[PDB]
Each structure stands twice: as C-alpha cells, then as structure tokens.
C-alpha cells in the first residue's frame, strides 16, 4: 500500500525530488505528488535509501526491500512473510467511522441558539 | 555562517550558573 502513504503538512506539494541525467539541461526537480503519480513506490524507496547507511551494503540492503503500491503481493513473497509490523502512525477515525454510541458518549459542548439557520 | 544557541546549550550554561551561585553562597560565610 505504498501508493496510500500519507504526508504530513504540505509535503505533497513542497517536497521536491531532484535528479540529474548527467547531460547539460538534465536537471529535473519533481514534487512529491508528481513523483508519486509517476512511480507509486519511489517515495518510500527514496526515504529508505536515504535512511540506510551510506556504504557498499546499502544496495544489498535495498535488494531485500520489496515495495508494492497496492494490497496485491506476489504469492511467493506472501508465503515468505513471517511477521507484520505495527503501523507507526495510528490512523485517526472519521466521523463516518465513529459509532453512534461513541458520539453519544462524547458530551455536547454548547447550547446552540434555537433561532439559528445553521 | 551564523550559529545558534540550542536548548541543550542554554541548559548547560544554566547548570554552570547554578553551581557558581552556590559557590557564591558558600564563599559568603
């Protein structure tokens, strides 16, 4: 589900991924959103690549990384799977997801005037 | 290039200042 990552703040629009083809005029600067639309794996891949130590083991380590944009995973990889790590960020619930019992449990904070359009 | 003062640096300086104030007190008698 690397396609469904979430950036905090305006990083989708402000974070810029820079690359150079090596040729003159080959400098490319692409925002996080554009890079995500192009490759739904590049953002997580690049974050991991940057966090790994900058030595000759890094690309071997990246060979053990398997990124999949969606819920689909190849069968052999799925059979290899051993453990699932807890998600680092707990996803906040939407009102559409909250149960009526929870809404009732949460108190009403104020008395709205009856003669109000709202 | 400019340099900036961190909270850790401020805390270190404050620790030193507290030691010096206690030195003042113990030298006052």
């Amino acid at each position: 589900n690397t396609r469904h990552i979430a950036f905090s703040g305006n990083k989708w629009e402000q974070k810029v991924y820079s690359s150079h083809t090596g040729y003159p005029g080959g400098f490319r600067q692409v925002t996080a959103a554009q890079l995500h639309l192009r490759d739904p794996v590049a953002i997580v891949k690049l974050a991991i690549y940057g966090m790994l130590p900058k030595n000759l083991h890094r690309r071997t380590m990246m060979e053990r990384l398997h990124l999949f944009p969606d819920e689909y995973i190849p069968e052999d990889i799925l059979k290899n799977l051993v453990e699932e790590l807890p998600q680092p960020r707990k996803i906040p619930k939407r009102l559409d997801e909250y149960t009526q019992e929870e809404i009732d449990a949460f108190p009403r904070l104020w008395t709205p005037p009856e003669d109000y359009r709202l | 290039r400019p340099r900036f003062v961190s909270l850790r640096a401020k805390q270190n300086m404050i620790r030193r200042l507290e030691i010096e104030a206690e030195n003042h007190y113990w030298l006052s008698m």
């Binding site: 904070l109 104020w110 359009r117 | -």
Partner: protein, 146 residues
C-alpha cells in the same frame, strides 16, 4: 435550529436542537472549552469535538454563536481546516493524496526547489502554530516545521 422549507411559498420552522450535556466539569467559564476543561487537550483529529462547531456543509460557526474564546475559535477553525484536508469529515462537504496536519491549502504552496543551506534551510510547515501550547506528552517538543 430553524430551517426554511419551500412549496411558491416558503416558511421557516424551528426543529430539534441539541443542548449542552449535563454537569459541566467547570461551570461558570468563559468559553465552552473552559467549561469542559479542554483548553489544551484537543487536536485536529478530535472530530467529535470539532464537528460541534461546524456548519452541515463544513464551514465554521461564528464566534458570537458558539461562545468560544477568540483564541479557541482560531484554534478550532485551524483544526477543522486540518481535519477537512485530512479527510476526517467526509460528510460535511458542500455537495488522491492522503494528508494530515496540513497548515496551508494544497493549491497555494509552491514547491521548495532551492532549500537553503544548513543555517538557512527552507522548512516545510507541519501542523499549526496555534496549537503550540497544547499538552506536551513527549520529551522533545513537537516540531512545527519539517
């Protein structure tokens, strides 16, 4: 809450309106937030709190009507903006990149093509500075810029 109904003839009927829950923890306070002891204990994701000050289509309600403080009205407005941009109010809408804690409207920020040197880095704002005084449960202060 009065609602206008048409048939042309139009008339306004006052319907059922919710009331403040019984037994406020701190009665006789300025704002509902002070009355219920929530001065620095809500965030952008507390939709149950935030939606109580929201028009059915997502807009904020005026401070005069809500009774909120000026600072608390600003905090609620910004938290509601962040909740909307994070998609936590799917039903409070006028009629795909996941986000959260987005201070600015997505279409109004420019890409940071030239982040500065280390001493003058252009940082990406995260969250809102209005919530800077919230309760701190972490050893390090939460960063407003990334």
């Amino acid at each position: 809450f009065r609602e206008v109904v048409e048939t042309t003839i139009i008339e306004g009927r006052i319907t059922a309106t919710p009331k403040e829950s019984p037994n406020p923890p701190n009665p006789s306070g300025q704002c509902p937030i002070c009355r219920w002891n929530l001065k620095h204990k809500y965030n952008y994701d507390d939709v149950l709190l935030l939606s109580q000050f929201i028009r059915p289509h997502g807009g904020m309600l005026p401070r005069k009507i809500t009774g909120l403080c000026q600072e608390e009205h600003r905090k609620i407005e910004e938290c509601v903006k962040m909740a909307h941009r994070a998609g936590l109010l799917p039903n409070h809408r006028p009629r795909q990149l996941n986000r959260y804690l987005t201070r600015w409207a997505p279409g109004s920020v420019k890409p940071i093509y030239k982040k500065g040197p280390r001493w003058n880095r252009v940082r990406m704002p995260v969250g809102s500075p209005l919530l800077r005084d919230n309760v701190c449960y972490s050893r390090t202060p939460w960063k407003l810029y990334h």
